[PDB]
Structure formats: C-alpha cells, structure tokens
Amino acid sequence: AXXXXXG
Amino acid sequence: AEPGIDKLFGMVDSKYRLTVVVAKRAQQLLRHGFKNTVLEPEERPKMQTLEGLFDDPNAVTWAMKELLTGRLVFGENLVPEDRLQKEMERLYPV
Amino acid sequence: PQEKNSLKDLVYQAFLRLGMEKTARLLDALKYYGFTFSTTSGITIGIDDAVIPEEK
Amino acid sequence: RVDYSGRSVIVVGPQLKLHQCGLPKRMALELFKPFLLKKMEEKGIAPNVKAARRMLERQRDIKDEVWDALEEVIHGKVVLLNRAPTLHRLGIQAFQPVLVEGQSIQLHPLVCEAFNADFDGDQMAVHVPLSSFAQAEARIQMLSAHNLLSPASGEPLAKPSRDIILGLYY
Amino acid sequence: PVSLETPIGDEKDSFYGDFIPDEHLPSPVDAATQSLLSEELEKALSKLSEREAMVLKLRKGLIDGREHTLEEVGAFFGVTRERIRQIENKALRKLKYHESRTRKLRDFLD
Amino acid sequence: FNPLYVMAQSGARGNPQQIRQLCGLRGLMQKPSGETFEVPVRSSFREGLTVLEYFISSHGARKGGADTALRTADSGYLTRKLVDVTHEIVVREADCGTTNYISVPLFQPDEVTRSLRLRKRADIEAGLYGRVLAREVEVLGVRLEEGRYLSMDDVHLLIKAAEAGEIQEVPVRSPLTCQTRYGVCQKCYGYDLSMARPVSIGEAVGIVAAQSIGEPGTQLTM
Amino acid sequence: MEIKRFGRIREVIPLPPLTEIQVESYRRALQADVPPEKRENVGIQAAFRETFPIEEGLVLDFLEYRLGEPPFPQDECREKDLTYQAPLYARLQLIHKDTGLIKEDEVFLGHIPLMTEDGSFIINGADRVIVSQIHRSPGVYFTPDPARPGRYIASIIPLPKRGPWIDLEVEPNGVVSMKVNKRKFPLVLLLRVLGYDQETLARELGAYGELVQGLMDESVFAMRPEEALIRLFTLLRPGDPPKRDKAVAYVYGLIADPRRYDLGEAGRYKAEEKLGIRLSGRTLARFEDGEFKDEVFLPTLRYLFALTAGVPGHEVDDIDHLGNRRIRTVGELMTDQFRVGLARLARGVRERMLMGSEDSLTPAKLVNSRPLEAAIREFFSRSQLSQFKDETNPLSSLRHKRRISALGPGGLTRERAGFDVRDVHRTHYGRICPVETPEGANIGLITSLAAYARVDELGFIRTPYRRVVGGVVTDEVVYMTATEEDRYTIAQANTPLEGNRIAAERVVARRKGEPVIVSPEEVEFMDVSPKQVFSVNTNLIPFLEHDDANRALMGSNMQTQAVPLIRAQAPVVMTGLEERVVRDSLAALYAEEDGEVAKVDGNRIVVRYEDGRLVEYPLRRFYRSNQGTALDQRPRVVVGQRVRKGDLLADGPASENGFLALGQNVLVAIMPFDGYNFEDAIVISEELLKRDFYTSIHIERYEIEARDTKLGPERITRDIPHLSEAALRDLDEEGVVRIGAEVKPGDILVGRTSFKGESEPTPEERLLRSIFGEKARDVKDTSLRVPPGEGGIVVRTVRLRRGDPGVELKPGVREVVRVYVAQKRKLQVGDKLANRHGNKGVVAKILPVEDMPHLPDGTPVDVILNPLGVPSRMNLGQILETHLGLAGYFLGQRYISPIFDGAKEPEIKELLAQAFEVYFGKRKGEGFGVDKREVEVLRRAEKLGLVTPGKTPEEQLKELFLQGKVVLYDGRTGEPIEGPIVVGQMFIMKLYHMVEDKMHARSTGPYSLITQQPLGGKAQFGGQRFGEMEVWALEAYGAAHTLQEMLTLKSDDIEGRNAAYEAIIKGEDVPEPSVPESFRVLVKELQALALDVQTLDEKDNPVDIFEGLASK
Amino acid sequence: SDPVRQYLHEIGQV
Amino acid sequence: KEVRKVRIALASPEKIRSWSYGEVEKPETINYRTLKPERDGLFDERIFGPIKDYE
Amino acid sequence: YRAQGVKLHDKHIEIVVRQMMKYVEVTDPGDSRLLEGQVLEKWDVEALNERLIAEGKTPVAWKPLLMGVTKSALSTKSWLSAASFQNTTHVLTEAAIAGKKDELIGLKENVILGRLIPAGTGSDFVRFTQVVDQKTLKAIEEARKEA
DNA sequence: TATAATGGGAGCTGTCACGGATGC
DNA sequence: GCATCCGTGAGTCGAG
Ligand SMILES: [Mg+2]
Ligand SMILES: [Zn+2]
C-alpha cells in the first residue's frame, strides 16, 4: 500500500 | 544522441524552428516518395535488413541529414503555399 | 580520485566544450568502465566491515 | 486516457546507449500494430490488411518474418517512456526502442535519477508518437541524450551515480 | 436499473460506468474495414462496363441508398426486366469469375 | 579501502550519520511528543539494539514515514497551484527593450551585523549563472558588456572581483522587470539552463518554472 | 538436518491461539452452543433484550432464540457462490394486555453467517474477513482547552451511534456551558431538571474557587423541575411545540433511555473508576418515580471544577493512551448491525400493530424479517471493515485476521488523521506492533496485534507480564491493560537470571514507558519475551535487532506477499515461530490422537486411532485462492507410520515438514555485477529455473452466462458461425473446452452464439452477399476467449444449467459455465524478489550457469545482490543471515535465532570455522594445494587489512572465511574477483507482483460511454492515462504536436482516431485533428446549466462545432 | 431551513 | 473558419427554447417491455433523435 | 530550498513572484470609467494610463497589489483557465454575467479545446517556417521570372 | 367510495485551512 | 476595527 512498494 | 545535433541547433534562432523544418521536410519526402531528395545516392541513409543494406524508411532521419548537407533553404515567406505544392507536384508526381 | 562532484564537473565541462553528442558518448563510456571495474574490484559487505572504533 | 500505449515493469539494461531502451516484443507488436499491418502488406506476409490482422489475432498464428517486419517498422522511430509521478519535464523522455525477449521494459541506468526510478518493482508507461511532427519533436527536443542538464539548476542530471562512481573511484 | 456513478472501490476514483464499453459508435478498425470494403467493391465494379456496374449499383443500393426493382432499372436504362435481370446476372457472374481469380474480396466475408 | 568508507567518500552510497549508526552509536531518539529521551541508544546496528532501544526508535521511524506520506500530497498541491498561476508564460519575443533591471547582491548583512559578508558560491550561482547584464560591468580589467550572457566562468570571475572589492552587486535582466506581455523576452529570461545557451523563443518558461519549484518539494520537511 | 538453536531466554507461556481475536469473539456473540436459558446478556442475546418488548394495546415480547444447522457445507457454499450461514429462529409471544390472550410462535428471522474453523466467513462464495476496529473508548474525559490555558474541557462519550457527545466548559463570562448536538446552553438549567436545588449545588461545589458562582442563576430555581424541563425543550427544539410529554420523552430518550443511550461496559467501568463513583446503569441519568435522577453530571462537574482549580489528584487524559482506546472485534461489530436491523424490524412491528385485523394477529403476521436480513447482508457485503480475504499464503490470512483498523464506520476518515493518531504511543508496548504498518496513506491507521497480546472482554488490549517478588521471578503470569501496567516497574526480559533470582545489581526497567535503572528490590514485574513487542510477521525476521525499523517494516509487509512455490523451503535461519504459524492458520493437517496411519494417497489419508476408529482426512488439492495462488496439501506420512497426537499428516501450501516456507534458500554473493544489479535490480542463475526454484502454480477463473433475450436465447454450443475445425479442435460436443487442453491467447474456452441486434445491412453487405451467394447467418459468435497475455491448461469446467437438479440461477439466466485455467510460472525477468530484512528488487538478468561467479571448488552462486543496497538502508540482519547461511551450507544445518536473543557473532564464527574445515580440509585430503589466483586475492586481502600478514595461505583463507568472505572466480574470465566476496545462504521469496500480470499494451480498443475516451485497466484492454502532469511535461518540452495528438487522435476525437488508423494502415501520414468529443460534452453540460458557450472566430461570429446537428 | 418542519408549521396555522 | 475565441453568457429562456428540440412532458424513461423510448419521455426519439442511423 | 540542499535558479521563483504582483488596486479613477478600489492588471492599467495621458486627460491613481498564487490564478483573464482550476461555479457565474471572452492566450485553454498550444513547435514565431530544396526553389524562381 | 382516524423523524460529533463576509 | 460562520480545497500511477 503506497511509499516505494512494503505494501 | 542524433548525429550532428549541435550543428543543427547551431543553424537556427530557436530549437523549435529546427523541429518544424525537419518535420515539414519529412512530410514533403513522404508525400513525394523521396524523389525530391537532395541526397546523392552515396549519402542515402541505410537500414540493415536480413537481405542486406536498404533505404532507411525514416523520413525524419532523412530530413535531418539533408538539413546537415546545407542543400536546404528555410525561412518565413519563401513562397506562397499553393504555388510550392503545385510546383512540387509537377516536378515529382505521386 | 574521481568521485561524484568531480565527475559532475567533468560532465558539465564536457557538455560546454564538446557538445551533447560527445557528452553522450562520454557518459556511455563512463558507464561502461565504471560498471565493469566495480564488478572486478571486489567490493562487498560483511558484518566485520562495520568497524567499531576503540575510541567509542 | 490514450491509444497506442502500454506499461510494464522496468528492469536495468546497461548495454543500452543513452538514447536507447528495451521494449518487449509483444508490447511493441501491439503498439505498432497498424504500421506492422502496413509493412506486412508491403511484403509477402499477407494479402491485405484484414488478412494480416486476422493472422495476428491468435498467438499460434504468428511466425518469424513478422518480427523482422516489425523490426523494419520501428527503425529510427522513438517511443516515450513516462514514470508517474511526473514531477518535472524529464519525467517523460524519448528513446529509440530495441526489441527484447521477455515482458519487461529495459531502462537506461543514467536516466534513472531523473525519473526517480529504481528497480524495486517500479513500472513505466510507453507512448508511441504518431505523426511525423510528433516524432520530430520527440527525437529533437525530448530525446534523453539531448537533455543532459537540469532545466532547474543547470547542473547535469544524467550523470554517474552508484556503481559507476564506485568503479571509477576504485 | 443501477446507478452508473455507483462507486467501485474504497476510493473516490472509480465509477461503475467507467467500465462500460461503447458498443454503438464504430471502432477505427470497423470503419477502416468499411472503407476498404467500399474501395475494393468499387475496384471490382470497375472491371464491368458502366452499364452492368450501374445496374448492379442500383439493384443493391450503392447509389441512392435503396434497392430498385427490375422494372425501375429496366425503365431507367430503357430495357426489358428480363434484359435488366440478364445483365444483372452476367454482372454477378463476371464478378464471380473476378473473385475466383483475384480472391481480393474473400477476406471481408468474415 | 573499507567498503562503507569507500561508498561514503565517493558519494556512491551513504552519509556520515548512517555510517555512524552502522559502527558508532545510534544516537539520541525522540519521544512521540517531539521531546528527546535523556537516554541515548548506545548500540550500533552491527552490535544489535535492545528490545527497549528498538521500541524507543520506532517512534521516530513512524513519525518519519508519516512525514513522507503526508508530505507528498501537499507538495503535489503546490506544484498544481504553481502550474496554474504561471501556465500562460512563454518566451514570446527576443527583446521587450526594457531599460529596467534588478541588482543581484553578492554581499549580505552578517547576523552579527558587524559588516557585510560575501554570500555562498552556490547561492550567487543560483542568482547569476545564465543571466544577461543590463549594464556595462568592468572589473579586474575585463569587459563584461551590456547584453552578455553570463557563462559559469563569468560568474566565478565576478565572485573573484567581489572578493577584491571592485563590485558589490550585479545589474542583470530579470523576469521581475520584463515588459513582454503574456510572457517574457529572450534577454530578460536568460540561458535555457537545460542547454547552457540562450533560451529558444517559444519555450514554455512558466510550466518549467512551476516544475522546477515543484519537484524538490517532496524533499522539504513538514 | 540438525537444527541448532541459540539463546538463553526461557519463554514461560506459549503464544495464545493466534486467531482467538476472531473465533472467541464470534462464538461469544452467537452463544450458539449455549442452552437458551443459560445465555449471558451479551451479543445477539443482548440485541434481542434491547429490542423487546415491542409495545402499543398489543405487546410482543421475546423468549429465546435458536440457530439451526447450515443448509450447506462450507465447500459447497464456495462452489455455488452461496453464503455459509445458519437459520435463526426467535421464539416470540403476543400478549393482548386487556384480553390476557397469549399467542406464542417460533418465527424465522433469516440467516446469520457462520465463522469457519479458521476465523473467516464465506459470503456469496468468496472468503471474507472482518477486521477489528480501534476507537476511542466510551467514558468521561478531561482535556486541555487549546484556546484558554488554565481552562479545561470535559467530554462524556458514549458508544458510537448510541447517542451524542456532550461537552462541559467554563466560559469567559464564568458560566459553565453544556454542548449537545451543536447547542451551547447553561448547564444550570439541566441541573434544575435533574432535581438539584441551589442548596445542594452550593454544599457540593462550594469548596471550589468561586467557579460555583458561574453556576449561580436566580432565574433557574425560579422554575422548578417542570418549567425548567419545558425551557430546555424550547432551547433544544425551536419551532416544535413545548408540550409536557414531548419534553419528557425527548430528554429521556436523549439522556436516560438505555435503548437510545449507551455507554459501554467499558465506558461505564471507566467513568466509575475516573469520577470515583458507582453507576446503576449505562445512561447519564434515570427516570424514576415520575422524575429525573442524576448519575453522571454532578460528579463530572465536580471533577472538571477540581481540575480547573488545581486541586491535587486530578489529571487530564491522554486520549491516545491504550487505556482510553479499545477494540471492537467481529462480535461487537456484527452485533451493532444486528441491533440496527432489529430496531428496523421493531418499527415495522409497531407499524403493523396500528393497522390490521386487531382480533387475529400471530407473531408471524407481525414480523417482517426483511430489514434485519438487509442489515446483516449489508454488513457482510458492503462494510468497510468486511474485507475480501487475503489467502496468498497462510501468513497472509493469519495477519489479516489479526489486523486493527482506525478507519471504517464511526472511525477515522484519513483526512482527519494527522500525526497524533498515527504515532506509536508508549502504551503500544507489547500490545500493537510498532513495526508492521503500510507505507502509504494508511500508515499508523492500520496495524497488527502483537503476538502475545489478547483483547479482553471490555475490548482493551492486554499483554502478559511475570510477577516479581523480592527479586524472584515467578512463573505466575498476569495480563494487564495499559492503565494497569502504568502502576508498576517492569524489568526487560533479557535481564540475567540465576534460577528464578535476578542476577544483576542494576536492572533495566520501565515506569509509565520511561526507561529507568533500578535495583532488583524495586522490580515488580518482568517481560515474558522480546517476542511480545512485535507482530507475528515481524517475529519472523531473524537478526531483527540489527535491522533499522523502516526496513523491518518492509520485510514484515512483504512476507504477506510471498507466493507459495512448488518447491518451497523453510528458512536456513529461523526465529522459531515458523511452526506455530503453520499450525494456527490451519494450513497443515495434524493427527487428532495417537494412532497408526492406515492409508496414504495424494487425495486422502486414513488414520486408525487408539479408539479403534478409522478417520479419513480428504486433502485439498490445487484449489484456487482468492488471489489466484494454488492452495494444496501434500501428504507427509507413509502407510503404517506410528503417529502421536498433534503430529504432522499433510503439509499445506507454503509448508515444508510443518515449517512455514515462504521462499527458497539460495546461495548469494554480495557484489556488483556489470550494472545488472544497479539500483536494487537483482541478477539470478538459470540454475534456479532448471531446478524449478521459484516456480509457482496459479489458477484463473473465467466465467460466462447464457441468458434469455428479447431477441432470442443465447446458447453454449460447438456450432459457431464461420469457424474452422482448427479453432474448434479442443471444444467438446457441448461447446466447452476439454480438460487437459492447452489454451493460448485468442483461443475459445466456451463457445457461445447470440441472436444479432436487428441489422440494417449496408449496401456493401447486400452486394457482397449477392457476390458470395451465402445467407447472412441468424446468430453471431459471442464466445468466451482467452484474454491477451493469459492462458494455460484447463483443469476444471463447471456447468450449471437451468432445469437441472439443485440448480436455480438468477432471473433470465439459462446457464452458467466456468472454466478454470492453471499455469506453472517459472521465475522470469521482471518478477519481484525480496528477503525478510526489507531488501527487495526485480530480477534484471538471468545468466547461463557458466557466466556466474563461482567458488574455487566449482560451485556457482545462485544470486548476486548489490552491496550498495546495504549502507543507505542500514539493514544488517541480511548480512548476518548470510554468514550463518554460509556455515549452514557446509555443515548441512539450519538454525533457530530468536529475536533479540540470537546467535551472536562469536558463535557464528565458531560455526564458520567448522565449516571452513569442511570446505577446505576436504580439498587438502583430495590432493590439491592453494591456487595461484587464491594467492593473488590473498595478497590484496593483506593490503586490505582483512588478514594478518605472515600466516600461511590456509590460516589466511580461514581468517577471511571467518569474516564470512571467500575467494570468488569470475565465470567469464576465470580470473578471480580482486577482493574476497561475502557469500552465503539467504532466504529469499518471490512476491505476488509478477511481470506476467502487469505487461499490457494497446493500439486501439474500447471507449467510454459519455466521454468516448479509451477505458482504463488491463482487463478492459485499456489505454494508459495521460494526466494533467504528463501534459505539463509535454508543454515544458514545447512538444506541441505530440501533445495535441494525445488530446485528440489518440483519445476522444472520433473522426480523428478513425482517420488516423485508416491513414496508418494505408501508409499515409496522419491527418489534422479536430475538436475532441469531450469538449462537445463540456458545451452540452454547460447548456444544461443554462449557460451559453459559444465558439467564435476572430470577427466574433459564431462557429458551429456540432456541424449543424444541434441547431434547428 | 427544513421544508418538512416549515409545511408542518403552515398546517399548524389553520 | 478558425475558432479564435470562446464566449460565455446567460441563456434567455428564449435561447433555451431555441436550443430545445421538444419539451419532455413525462417522467418516463423506456417501456418496461419493448425497451424502446417512451413518447414525450427523457429518452424520446421524437425529440432527441433516432436510436438507429437513418432509421 | 538551500536548507535542504536544493539548487534552484532564482529565475523560476521570480517568474512566479512576477505572477503575484500582476494586479493593482485603483485609489483614484481620475478621468476613467474605473472605480476606487476596483482591481485590474498592471499591464491594462498602464495601457489605459498611456491612452489617457495621450488624450491630455487625468491618469488613474493606482496601488501595487500583492496576491498569492491561488487568488492570482483564479484572477486570470481567461475564464477557461480559471474554471478548470478551482471554485468552478464562482468563476463560471462571474464570467457568464460579464459575457466574458477567452482569447485562448494561455496553454490551458488550448489544451482543453485540443488546439496546438502557443508554445514550442506551436509558437507563432516558428510554426510558419517553410522548407524547400534548391531545385524546386529554382523552378519556382523561373515561374516567378516568367510572369 | 363512507365507524372514526387531523404536526416527522434522525441526528452522529479526533482536519484543517484558511478564505472571505457578517456581527457588537 | 475584531471575533465568528459557512463553503471549498486537501499528490501520482497501476488494480478494484
Ligand atoms: Mg521504486
Ligand atoms: Zn524583457
């Protein structure tokens, strides 16, 4: 979910 | 980078004028099937196929090269539009 | 030694003096040698490479 | 939204010259599909346009000469690569496409900094400029290798970083 | 009926109607196909004399839109309905030979 | 030739502080309030943080993530505001022939207020490089003419003459003074900084400005 | 395969049942197993009790309820797209008060969804999960007024939609205001209505600093309880007639009515503890003996004034403290919707009781169950907290069941959510994981329950602690709330112990979250484990203490995204929680009692227990999950095997011998490679593909309906107009592709024909028809074909026909066909890989084996990771993992390394030494000395200070090996890499973000209804969005024709796009664009707004863009 | 403000 | 001609009637059986135009 | 920006600040039709003042007005730009009442209409360029030499 | 086509971020 | 002049 892509 | 790009930018007061010139020339070549080209047969841009070297299909490539030869004239109001059209149609039919 | 700032100034100066064609060639070159050399140089990371100074 | 456009995951390709990029075969076929129909009728591969399109409909109906015809279609032309979010003009750049096996778009390493793209899963979209005018604008003003400085600061934008700097320093 | 602006997803960025294809208007492929059909049909109707080509263009409606009877094309050309139907037959047949030969119009039959 | 040291020095990867966390101490940590814990994380990452140390740091971490996520939005918004308020600006002529100009100061008042001191090189470069002199400027026996596009070297020289006390401020052509309607002229603008040559007539300056101010916005704190 | 475990921390209790937060909650709400008379008043029982009796004269009261058995088993519900649910009956009785007549009947209320064994639901065939919600606890709170420094606000908060928030404040004019429903009025009035007299308020509030005078109003006592009540009603209801019974009804309903106003048990308890009083019920006041009696208001005013004065023993509240925030679990949330639906049913009942034949009414005639069913169905389908279940792997499901959301109904809008709500509060310790949260817009608003944490009956999260008395650590474990925890000094779990006694003179402890160093005499409690601080996901990261929290967050998150692999392995380095995760998720199958295994098959296992009974366990095989990943169980036992209770029978997906397997153990080298690992990109060996590492199975479901039409019926058939036997080759007699057939893009899965929409054939078609002499067919080809970029092997077909047993479809539908298509996906270029430390990257290059860096003994590495991904990321765990991995490679062993009690460098060095002996002394026995290249590398290592100069080649190679580094040869040259390279085993996973699901391209395609712009999305064969910002980008390049093309020829200029395509296929340059259709749309929508938008030429004369069509 | 309340008042007038 | 400007102003009821091709009188959409436009409805063909081309 | 180590030319900042000082407020209408307090562009007020001085009339007394980007953007002349930004209804009513014309000066307008933006290859300065080889140029020169 | 029946219910609450207009 | 109410904004893809 959002940011550079964790989730 | 496109070959000779620095000289091309050198030939104009505005880089966009270069684009317009290159593009209009490319369309002239496509419309007349290249018969109007100012390139000599040895200067013709080539493309490697499986058979062997052939004419480069890319009219923009051609235009940039012609511009590079100095054989082209450009500027505002060189000639009325319809007169240019009709003369180019007379000299090289398509 | 060549680092970030110096390489940046080289690319600027190269743009200025030799144009974008040559600067493009130069960039691709720098790319090639930089990568190829980085490979063989032997740069790695192991836990012991974080060297805690005694001073601490 | 727009026609003649695709998207995939970006992958690093250092073998590419600055002005190039890796565009998957399937992507390029669907993107240049009309040009490829025309080039197919320009050779012996198909009787006409509709025959060629019906020929390309199924995947098992696709042979070997068609990829060479496609190679001939895309010669000299450039695509647009774009990575969202598009924060300044260098978020879109023009590359000559080079057909590659697989399903991933291969991006040149130097331009990464200007796209703010890495390779931790990022994607990019491809746009095929159509007219001769469009193509001319793209190749002159929008080509990656023509844009080497920041329109913001003046300083270089495509410039060595990471592994490159490391190798030269070493 | 259900709302076209029925939200899809937990964001405001989607509407149900955004997924609904417009079947009515013709796609570029379809229109191109119709253009090439009309041009190939004109290419095959030029292999007939202007009379038989015109009778085939009046009996099928590529002229004023509608299809005329044998009495109207026979009264227009100034011939018998048997005669107008006869040149219609020979036009159709010459067209059948042209098609069996060149095979240009086969691909349009879907 | 230690890898961290190398990657740090070359500018390939890492800064002093990160490295410091890898080797030295992690450092002071912040409470959710914005207050700082009197107790510092004494461990490095190579050593291994305690449970409690890790938990203490988590506060800062969450705060920074939230800062990122909540920043992207407002940065975008600013970009769009800028694009809308400048969109009609394009380079329309070669010269508006304005006799007006601005004076870029090479010296700024010290905070001690003791005297005036030179400004930083980067800053003066930001206000000078690629600009056109609206008056004649002669220093160190070199003649910088009215109409001249200051190359980077021209700038450096101007700083050198500034240190020599021959010049305190530089008269230059600026958009703040351009009188081209619905845009700016070529001279008033300056270098197309993307090509280090004068700007081409017809380049959408406004958009480019909005984007140039926009892009690094996602890097400014909240 | 020896498994060596490290660490000295002895865990006193195991982890609780990990799905208990779901299962226990629902079981409690339903009380389905409790005999009716023994049910507690909680859950749906409480809902019934609040709803009934329904009065107005007739009266309908409630006796009991019952849940019957499910009409269909779970599997069958999954297949038929049915909800798994149980029938609900309520025993109701109708009394006519006057007649005394009593009619009693059991009425059917509809169905309620049942929770499966693993804690999830089946709603319309699809597995769903109800996410727990965090909110502000009901109760009485005191907070600082942001406007006025020395002033404070009192807030009385009930449960959500159980009544209004009431505020108490001391105004600048000194009068104390109450705010209800956004109405500010003097509290004095309400105090008068409550029965308070100036005397009682004077003696109660006297002691305070003249605040009480702001409560002094002569005009208010002058009106006694009745007039004050009517005065208040006029104040709260302008224009509504101030009738006496309306004022009483309104104020009662607003304040004293337990049916319209509810503090929770939690709100009631907390208010009690805070104001130091006792409550008779859950309302702010009562109606007793005709009048209103106080409960809350006076104590609250008393406290507020005391806090304002500065009187000691009065604090403001931290509203983010986990003592003031509680959890609504499945049970509570469902019960809330049930209560709403019941209330609607009651409005219905009273409706029908006014109307009727008043002499004959059964409970059946009165009860319409429809609104209740609607509220339940709505909750389970369209609620924000009801989420499509993540079954990607078993950890996904478990984590999903353990989620906590601050969003949803009555929850935070993300817009209202700033930093304070999203922070890690000190009270999160041991309760809600500090690591595991999304990076995007949801950060801190969606979280995960800590591993040892349990939600209590009040809804507060509690974490275990060990009691410590006089420096002695008991095996007594007490679970505390944060409020409770705040009273103690609590030692860290890693504090040294000899026996049960604290062995250090200085022990690290917490007091209200603050770190403090204390003597063992002062230690009251002690942590159970480092494990208790973190989520299940985070507890799976080994060497966590060496990873920056931000990268740990990512490893946490990405484990959720791991794809089950056909060859999946458990990690070489484990944290020790890998088995419990498999067990609690009900992934694997386990033995019930001791016994001997009778039969073993791919399809089933049969066990004979000590009872003598045969039990048969069917195995789920190649089932498709919600996310399309393959879920199948494989038998791990053989015939005749003796098994004890709880022994493994079958491994589920992502399980290797009962251990969680999210990926592969691969041999990695950490070095740059030729730019192919630049910026997080990853290089891999073809050997991985060759041995089917990172191969995963995926199943897609395609569906098609044949329905009845006004133009005639659609039909599934093999007879499809104008198709060759070639295209029909794999279709069966009925028109459905055969099991086992390979399908490729363009292929037909299900043949379908539809009667054509009435056709005006264009003259071209009439003539062409005459020319070919073939009748235009009645129907057309509507068949379902494989979409672009998809395909595989057909493993199943389902066919449901109307007029067939057990089958009833939705109206108009003649039949439904489903085709399932399975694919084996080998790792390819563009697929995303990651480790547990947050290191993630896309595979950029697949090298032939000979091209790979190799060990001197000839063994090639699997994976090349760039060291530049390390320094800036500060996640060193991956490094340690790799080192221990190295050891494990040569010793043939695996490790358990518990978080913050791990393997430490020295032990890893010993192990590495052992492995060196295996890696080298073998070579020494085989007859080979040190290689020349090794010598060169050793020379460079000596320059690097990596090895001590003067030792033999063997001693030096051992020194490097102990630093975890090895000599590596470049496969392309045969020359060594100039430095020694770190090499070892690492656990790496393939994530669900796969380039195969992503690549998409369009020439032309479908357009939208109103806009005539291309559709979005891969399934719709959409085009890419070129947004406002892309436009700005094109403008800034001054590329005007490319831009104009985007805005016209390539989108909504209809004539333009058609003409462009025609021109390109003809080899002609593209023509000049014209007006885009959406500008035309703009014009028409402005006209409908009664605005005249006119396109003018420079002469200011109108220009028609509609080409006359809109002008009469 | 609220049209229901308003009409109810206008009715409560006769 | 070339579009060089765009004007925006108030629409007089007479302008609105001039634009109009007919007054919709009935709050009816399409017939519940023939699925064709009702007479004087929101989707009438008599006002807004034919559903099929040239038919 | 300096603080965060961002090199950014003053130029762009000056372009925006330029758009901020775009407007002025009249303090005395003089011999004009304007009104005390009425706000208008500095350009237009300077053209009016030059036309009024050229007529020997009293010029307009005006005051420099600073306004932030959002207001200045909505305060544009072109209502097609103002509408597609913010407060759409407000913009559109104001304009429809004023019977406003959009001259399509900006980029936004032309983008909406789908025209060729007045920028880059679309600049009136360069788009009217023609190109011809020397052969055709000489043939046409002979045609012009004939008549 | 006819006992007589004569004023409604649901709110829903942790964000600014100000912007102008309106009020003692 | 200075408190206070109401209405309009709150980033980008991709998949739902
Ligand atoms: Mg990325
Ligand atoms: Zn100027």
TrEMBL record, chain H:
It is found in: Cytoplasm. It comes from the Bacteria. Interacts transiently with the RNA polymerase catalytic core. Sigma factors are initiation factors that promote the attachment of RNA polymerase to specific initiation sites and are then released. This sigma factor is the primary sigma factor during exponential growth. Belongs to the sigma-70 factor family. RpoD/SigA subfamily. This is RNA polymerase sigma factor SigA.
